[PDB]
Amino acid sequence: NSLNHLTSQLRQNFQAISSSIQAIYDRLDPPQADQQVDRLITGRLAALN
Amino acid sequence: NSLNHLTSQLRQNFQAISSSIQAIYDRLDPPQADQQVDRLITGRLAALN
């Protein structure tokens, strides 16, 4: 159960524009993408916790 | 490891302007800054949990 829960957390957006990081640097300039990607980093660190 | 991990999480912004509360105030109006301070509260209570 722990692995299926952990892997399914990668679908979450965490109020980001996209759940795929490459889809963020493709859409926005690098300065704007960092403040969007940061939500994916924090949300997925909490998933590991 | 539990002490330094807990203290390092005080650096985080949790999608606020800054990690310092006194920086959230003196930059923003009170009712707006109140919403920003709440972001630090949830992030740091989760760190304690």
UniProtKB/TrEMBL annotation, chains A, B:
Name the record gives this protein: S
